[PDB]
Design a protein around this ligand. Structure first.
Ligand SMILES: CC[C@@H]1C(=O)N(C)c2cnc(Nc3ccc(C(=O)NC4CCN(C)CC4)cc3OC)nc2N1C1CCCC1
Length: 113
């Protein structure tokens, strides 16, 4: 009722709900919550990744309407993927998992009306 920007943000809300849903859990689960570098014994993670990002943080910010437009939302989602590509060996399973989830994200985002 408030126009294209309101509709875009609601569509992005729906993308996020799908990425968090059981449908994609085989590959999305490493991205549900912030990386716990202490628990994973990754003593270099925060030295390499300066801006951690994950789906629960995107959800908090999106629910608080902290993204001014859909491009702001997309930047944080893509930052999450980019962190995974930057930190891990390129042939690691987690990179393939990030790419499977990004395939979903980019497909849905491309079809935003
Ligand atoms: C932060 C680096 C990278 C990344 O980018 N993200 C996003 C990530 C997000 N979440 C996780 N989470 C878990 C990852 C592995 C395990 C696990 O159970 N590993 C077993 C432990 C015993 N044995 C060695 C066999 C394997 C549990 C996890 O959550 C509790 N891992 C992530 N990885 C991986 C971390 C090391 C390789 C890559």
């Amino acid at each position: 009722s408030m126009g294209k920007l309101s509709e875009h943000l609601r569509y992005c809300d729906s993308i996020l709900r799908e990425m968090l849903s059981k449908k994609h859990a085989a590959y999305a689960w490493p991205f549900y919550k912030p990386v716990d570098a202490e628990a994973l014994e990754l003593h270099d993670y925060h030295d390499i990744i300066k801006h951690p990002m994950d789906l629960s943080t995107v959800k908090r910010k999106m629910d608080g309407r902290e993204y001014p437009d859909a491009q702001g939302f997309a930047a944080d989602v893509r930052l999450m993927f980019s962190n995974c590509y930057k930190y891990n060996p390129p042939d690691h399973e987690v990179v393939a998992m990030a790419r499977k989830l990004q395939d979903v994200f980019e497909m849905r985002f491309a079809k935003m009306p």
